[PDB]
Amino acid sequence: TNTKGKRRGTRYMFSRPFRKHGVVPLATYMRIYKKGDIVDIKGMGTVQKGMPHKCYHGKTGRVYNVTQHAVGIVVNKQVKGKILAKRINVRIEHIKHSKSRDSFLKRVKENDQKKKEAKEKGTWVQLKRQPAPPREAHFVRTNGKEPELLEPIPYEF
Amino acid sequence: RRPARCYRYCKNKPYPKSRFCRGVPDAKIRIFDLGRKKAKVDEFPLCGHMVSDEYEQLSSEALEAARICANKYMVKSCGKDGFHIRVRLHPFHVIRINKMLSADRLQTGMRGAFGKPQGTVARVHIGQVIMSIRTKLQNKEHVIEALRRAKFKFPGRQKIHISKKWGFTKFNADEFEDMVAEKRLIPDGCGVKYIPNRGPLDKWRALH
Amino acid sequence: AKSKNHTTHNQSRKWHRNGIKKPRSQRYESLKGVDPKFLRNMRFAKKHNKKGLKKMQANNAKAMSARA
Amino acid sequence: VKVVKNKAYFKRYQVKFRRRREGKTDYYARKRLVIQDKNKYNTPKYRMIVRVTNRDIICQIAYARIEGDMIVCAAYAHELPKYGVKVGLTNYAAAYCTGLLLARRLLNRFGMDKIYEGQVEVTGDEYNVESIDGQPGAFTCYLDAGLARTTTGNKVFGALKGAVDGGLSIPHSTKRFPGYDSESKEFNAEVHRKHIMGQNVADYMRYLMEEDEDAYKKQFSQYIKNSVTPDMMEEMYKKAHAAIRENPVYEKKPKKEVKKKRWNRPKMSLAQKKDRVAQKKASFLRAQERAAES
Amino acid sequence: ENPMRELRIRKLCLNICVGESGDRLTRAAKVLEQLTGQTPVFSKARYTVRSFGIRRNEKIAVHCTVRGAKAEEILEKGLKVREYELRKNNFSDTGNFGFGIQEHIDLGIKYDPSIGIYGLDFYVVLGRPGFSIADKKRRTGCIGAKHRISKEEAMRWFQQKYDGIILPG
RNA sequence: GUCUACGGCCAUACCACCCUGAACGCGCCCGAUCUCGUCUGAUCUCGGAAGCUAAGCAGGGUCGGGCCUGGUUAGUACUUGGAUGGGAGACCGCCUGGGAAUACCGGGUGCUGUAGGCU
RNA sequence: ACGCAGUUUUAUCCGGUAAAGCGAAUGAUUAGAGGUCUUGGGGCCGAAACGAUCUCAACCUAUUCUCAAACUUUAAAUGGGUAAGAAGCCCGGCUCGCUGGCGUGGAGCCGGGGUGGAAUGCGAGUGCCUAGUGGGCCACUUUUGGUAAGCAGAACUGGC
RNA sequence: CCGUGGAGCAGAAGGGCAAAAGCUCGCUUGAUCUUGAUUUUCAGUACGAAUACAGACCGUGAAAGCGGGGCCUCACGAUC
Ligand SMILES: [Mg+2]
Ligand SMILES: [Mg+2]
Ligand SMILES: [Mg+2]
Ligand SMILES: [Mg+2]
Ligand SMILES: [Mg+2]
Ligand SMILES: [Mg+2]
Ligand SMILES: [Mg+2]
Ligand SMILES: [Mg+2]
Ligand SMILES: [Mg+2]
Ligand SMILES: [Mg+2]
Ligand SMILES: [Mg+2]
Ligand SMILES: [Mg+2]
Ligand SMILES: [Mg+2]
Ligand SMILES: [Mg+2]
Ligand SMILES: [Mg+2]
Ligand SMILES: [Mg+2]
Ligand SMILES: [Mg+2]
Ligand SMILES: [Mg+2]
Ligand SMILES: [Mg+2]
Ligand SMILES: [Mg+2]
Ligand SMILES: [Mg+2]
Ligand SMILES: [Mg+2]
Incomplete structure (x- = not known):
């Protein structure tokens, strides 16, 4: 009864946001998609051929197929009782890289360089990521001035 | 005319007189200012206003009765054009009536139950001003008595405040005369135009 | 004769009994659906790998063993 | 009283695009010229x-x-007086000349001069470059x-024909x-050959x-103030194509400083x-004081 | 003492709005052909009316654009007919004007009884060198402020050349 | 310190008006016999170069409008979770954590890549 | 140590609701002030005259009060996906009819080299057969119709 | 002369579009033949619609490309 066709909940989602109507900029096209990249999917209302669905907006998947001017993605979609890895064919205009994997590759390269320098000079560099520790026992300063006194203010309207 | 006890607390979403209603009758109130409409700014220094305490609806007929009562007490109290009253709150919500006996069982039950448009109410948030009366400095008791006599005629509980601001504008009455005397605030009818100094220089050259 | 038409209550508590796990994803993923021109490339690539990859790769294995 | 001017027009106004406001591209053809299909990934x-210009x-x-x-x-039209084209910088002969120079310069940079000679005798035919097997591709x-x-x-298209006779594999149809x-939808090679060798300006001279020596002294003044005569043009470009095809190497200039800075007002x-x-x-307050009194 | 900024007749527009299509419209095109020495170009209506009887895509009017020597010649004939006397509100604020004539054989062409007598609308635009920026394809910009033509510049040019009379009433 | 050709980001780079531009360069400009296309060499196409930076263009300015960014707005409006909390209800106060926007005020107003050229 | 997670963190994307906004588009809407183009209408100088003048409306300019489930520049909290390593790095070479300036790109194959890569908790993966079930209800909070209900209808979580 | 969509895009609305997806003009039949994969509804069955390809034979354009119906979301139907 919700008129189950394609693209029905999308008065806002496939819209080009604001002061960005018009032609697509070409840096979206001129990018390199190899098998094994990790891509975000974001709807573009200007190119109406290969929009994915309203389901896969914002989902982040793996690339496995490359054609002339589109790309095939595998995306984990949740349905009723289980999640499934589906296979979508999306044009290039809806796609961008996730910066998360590139940040992780920078982590891996820093870890390899620290590992080589550590095996070189015998240092134990602790190249894991430690979460935010509690504050160490620091030592505050109150020179010159007594601390400012605060009190709750009287009500007015 | 159904009793206003039921058309009360803001339950349903706001439903304005618009493209989709198309059959709502006219609201009860039509004019909103009663006193000296063409009053200039320094002709009335103070203003007393009426703050709502509850979150509720007010009906257009109730606003109609209240502005008439306040108007009558003002023109009996401090003379004609000794006040400028403004109902700051306008009705735009449209309430619905699903009326029956349209006396037997045999018309319909609750089957087609999207009601016809009854009339117009005004939605109120807590701390929103209903009425504002700007008067002379001598008329302080008359404003309090007038808004007291309107307080009984609105539903619910709401209080009466005497503003710190000059006029209907948003500027302080203490800073007001000290700051209009030289530089910034040019009077504009009943309103007051603020000037920044980040304009073209033609404004400052047209001044002074 | 009226009944409750549609609901989604008591559904998440059914779904998380056995657990909403992922779809396994083993190594060497299924290769159907990929570009037929690329697939026609890769099949002859594989069989000529297995054809000609004996002699020169054996030479290079001997060379890299002699180096190290 | 006339119109309602424009106030939220600025607040909602999109600029077109940086190249489009200058008006130098279209992007509706650039989005099909630039973009390589993703099956090739880098090429x-x-x-x-x-x-x-x-x-x-x-x-x-x-x-x-x-x-x-x-x-x-890159190859430019004003380089041609170093090759022997003294004047005629924007004619169809200069178009063919610059295309030939550009093709020879690219092939000299990549080292594929000796193979892929292309065309020497200027005919204006449908000469499309064939790749040679056993050699690097065109x-x-x-x-x-x-x-x-x-x-x-x-x-x-004259620059196109110059590059094609130079030896670039560029797809083209003859009808432009x-x-x-x-x-009549036939093509004449001899007329296009005459137009390349530049006998149009020969006939017009x-x-x-x-007809009139007044116009002949009005225009063509730079021609007569170095030298131009039609037989010398028809043999001049014939010399010039060989002069390019023997030495396209382009000797970069020394640039250098030797200059005095200072032309343009900076930001205050x-x-x-x-x-x-x-x-x-x-100053306005001083005026308000003084001139109102005097 | 002003560099190459000369008011010159950019183009001259000639119009005949016949109320109908067919015979009288064709004879009006024949009139404009005999004036210009070039074939005219027709006009029509996006919407009709039925009150004065035009329909959609009816060949209502003819017109022509004349540039250069023939333009200044036919402008000379027009000011010759109207005795160089043009009122102030004949000039537009943006610098162009139009004045019009009736009785098309005032200009000096033989009358034929076959064709007839038509009312012919003359419209003059003024041009300075540099106005051809806004029309060309590749690089197009705003014309600017000091370069454009004013009411005052147009009326002073018409005072200078042809010795026109301005008629402020 | 600049421009041209091609661009990337797509208003910090628009719009209005006023100033200044030496050298190259872009233009404006002078003409239709060939190629071309129009009612019209105005637009498009083509052979140039007598003039001109007047305009575009390039730099600067406007207590400029807009944009971007940062304060104030404001720990306010809201809000995950909780209470045998208050309240007739309407709603409101508290613990726990997170946390916004306009008027108001201050600052800026293109940055770059490749190839080429002038001081 | 394998693997996993109704969880958190560390990154990274996504949304257009609460809220707010109208001196930002659209839609409604209150009142004052300024201005002189446009008329029609009133008055006055008058045979009459855009001859001159006063007024009216409309118009425009900056302002002002209030709004929106089928409006929106902005924009939360809660939330959804992905990543947090040996299936990964790095080196060297072979094959390709695909691509092509180029031994170029991209895939595949082979050989070699170094596992200590957020917190916390746990044993996981997988196949067959199939019963009963397909009449629900209530509670916090968010919500649609209704005056309202121990009413009808939804969402998240728990209970019966 | 101003004119950032205030118009038009067959239609109900929404989205999108300005040297364009709008208007005019010139060519035209890609509204053709054929295997598959995938999305959408979903039990992860179908019809319908759609996406990305592959191989022919073409249209167009100078060419890059575009095109296998309508700028997108509806316009349709098993066994026998
Ligand atoms: Mg009763
Ligand atoms: Mg049931
Ligand atoms: Mg084109
Ligand atoms: Mg001609
Ligand atoms: Mg012709
Ligand atoms: Mg010309
Ligand atoms: Mg200039
Ligand atoms: Mg100047
Ligand atoms: Mg500013
Ligand atoms: Mg500037
Ligand atoms: Mg919504
Ligand atoms: Mg709200
Ligand atoms: Mg059983
Ligand atoms: Mg069962
Ligand atoms: Mg049963
Ligand atoms: Mg609460
Ligand atoms: Mg119930
Ligand atoms: Mg029941
Ligand atoms: Mg314009
Ligand atoms: Mg629409
Ligand atoms: Mg086009
Ligand atoms: Mg095909």
Whole structure:
């Protein structure tokens, strides 16, 4: 009864946001998609051929197929009782890289360089990521001035 | 005319007189200012206003009765054009009536139950001003008595405040005369135009 | 004769009994659906790998063993 | 009283695009010239950019990257007096000449001069470059006519014919070369050959020298103030094509400083701007005091 | 003492709005052909009316644009007919004007009884060198402020050349 | 310190008005016999170069409008979770954590890549 | 140590609701002030005259009060996806009819080299057969119709 | 002369579009033949619609490309 066709909940989602109507900029096209990249999917209302669905907006998947001017993605979609890895064919205009994997590759390269320098000079560099520790026992300063006194203010309207 | 006890607390979403209603009758109130409409700014220094305490609806007929009562007490109290009253709150919500006996069982039950448009109410948030009366400095008791006599005629509980601001504008009455005397605030009818100094220089050259 | 038409209550508590796990994803993923021109490339690539990859790769294995 | 001016117009206004407000591209053809299909992943699509300007034509080969366009090789019309084309910088002969220079310069940079000679005797035929097996493949490139309209006789096609006889594998159909009969759909090679060798200006010089010497001294003054006569033009470009095909190497200039900086006013600072405002205050106040009294 | 900024007749527009299509419209095109020495170009209506009887895509009017020597010649004939006397509100604020004539054989062409007598609308635009920026394809910009033509510049040019009379009433 | 050709980001780079531009360069400009296309060489196409930076263009300015960014707005409006908390209800106060926007005020107003050229 | 997670963190994307906004588009809407183009209408100088003048409306300019489930520049909290390593790095070479300036790109194959890569908790993976079930209800909070209900209808979580 | 969609895009609305997806003009039949994969509804069955390809034979354009119906979301139907 919700008129189950394609693209029905999308008065806002496939819209080009604001002061960005018009032609697509070409840096979206001129990018390199190899098998094994990790891509975000974001709807573009200007190119109406290969929009994915309203389901896969914002989902982040793996690339496995490359054609002339589109790309095939595998995306984990949740349905009723289980999640499934589906296979979508999306044009290039809806796609961008996730910066998360590139940040992780920078982590891996820093870890390899620290590992080589550590095996070189015998240092134990602790190249894991430690979460935010509690504050160490620091030592505050109150020179010159007594601390400012605060009190709750009287009500007015 | 159904009793206003039921058309009360803001339950349903706001439903304005618009493209989709198309059959709502006219609201009860039509004019909103009663006193000296063409009053200039320094002709009335103070203003007393009426703050709502509850979150509720007010009906257009109730606003109609209240502005008439306040108007009558003002023109009996401090003379004609000794006040400028403004109902700051306008009705735009449209309430619905699903009326029956349209006396037997045999018309319909609750089957087609999207009601016809009854009339117009005004939605109120807590701390929103209903009425504002700007008067002379001598008329302080008359404003309090007038808004007291309107307080009984609105539903619910709401209080009466005497503003710190000059006029209907948003500027302080203490800073007001000290700051209009030289530089910034040019009077504009009943309103007051603020000037920044980040304009073209033609404004400052047209001044002074 | 009226009944409750549609609901989604008591559904998440059914779904998380056995657990909403992922779809396994083993190594060497299924290769159907990929570009037929690329697939026609890769099949002859594989069989000529297995054809000609004996002699020169054996030479290079001997060379890299002699180096190290 | 006339209109409602414009106030939220600015707050909602999109600029078109940086190149589009200057008006130099369209992007509706650039989005099909630039973009390489993703099956090849790295191999760039080379654009031959030929731009006609008053006093100068520009032949460049570029390709596209995400940081910007990367120009591989470029050749300009004013280089031709070093090759022996003294005047005639924007004629169809200069178009063919610059295309031939650009093709020879690219092939000299890549070292594929001795193979892929292309065409030497200028005929204006449908000479498409065949690749030679057992050798490195031919350079393939695609035109950009730009905003200029492709009409039979547009000298972007002359630059095309120059590059093609130089030996670039550029796909082209013959029906936009000049000399092509538009009613009867045959193509004439001899007329286009005459138009390449430049006997149009030869006939027009003979026409002016018969009809009116006033116009012949009005235009063509730079021609007669070094030298131009039609037989010398028809043998001059014949010399010039061989002079290019023997030495396209382009000797870069020494650039150098040897100069005095100082041409353009810089941005005046915040305090200086605010003190301009303060002087504009004080002078008007002084006027308000003085001239109202006197 | 001003560099190459000369008011010159950019183009001259000639119009005949016949109320109908067919015979009288064709004879009006024949009139404009005999004036200009070039074939005219027709006009029509996006919407009709039925009150004065035009329909959609009816060949209502003819017109022509004349540039250069013939333009200044036919402008000379027009000011010759109207005795160089043009009122102030004949000039538009943006610098162009139009004045019009009736009785098309005032200009000096033989009358034929076959064709007839038509009312012919003359419209003059003024041009300075540099106005051809806004029309061309590749690079197009705003014209600017000091370069454009004013009411005052147009009326002073018409005072200078042809010795026109301005008629402020 | 600049421009041209091709660009990337797509208003910090628009719009209005006023100043200044030496050298190259872009233009404006002078003409239709060939190629071309129009009612019209105005637009498009083509052979140039007597003039001109007047305009575009390039730099600067406007207590400029807009944009971007940062304060104030404001720990306010809201809000995950909780209470045998208050309240007739309407709603409101508290613990726990997170946390916004306009008027108001201050600052800026293109940055770059490739190839080429002038001081 | 394998693997996993109704969880958190560390990154990274996504949304257009609460809220707010109208001196930002659209839609409604209150009142004052300024201005002189446009008329029609009143008055006055008058045979009459855009001859001159006063007024009216409309118009425009900056302002002002209030709004929106089928409006929106902005924009939360809660939330959804992905990543947090040996299936990964790095080196060297072979094959390709695909691509092509190029021994170029991309895939595949082979050989070699170094596992200590957020917190916390746990044993996981997988196949067959199939019963009963397909009449629900209530509670916090968010919500649609209704005056309202121990009413009808939804969402998240728990209970019966 | 101003004119950032205030118009038009067959239609109900929403989205999108300005040297364009709008208007005019010139050519035209890609509204053709054929295997598959995938999305959408979903039990992860179908019809319908759609996406990305592959191989022919073409249209167009100078060319890059575009095109296998309508700028997108509806316009349709098993066994026998
Ligand atoms: Mg009763
Ligand atoms: Mg049931
Ligand atoms: Mg084009
Ligand atoms: Mg001609
Ligand atoms: Mg012709
Ligand atoms: Mg000309
Ligand atoms: Mg200039
Ligand atoms: Mg100047
Ligand atoms: Mg500013
Ligand atoms: Mg500037
Ligand atoms: Mg919504
Ligand atoms: Mg709200
Ligand atoms: Mg059983
Ligand atoms: Mg069962
Ligand atoms: Mg049953
Ligand atoms: Mg609560
Ligand atoms: Mg119930
Ligand atoms: Mg029941
Ligand atoms: Mg314009
Ligand atoms: Mg629409
Ligand atoms: Mg087009
Ligand atoms: Mg095909």
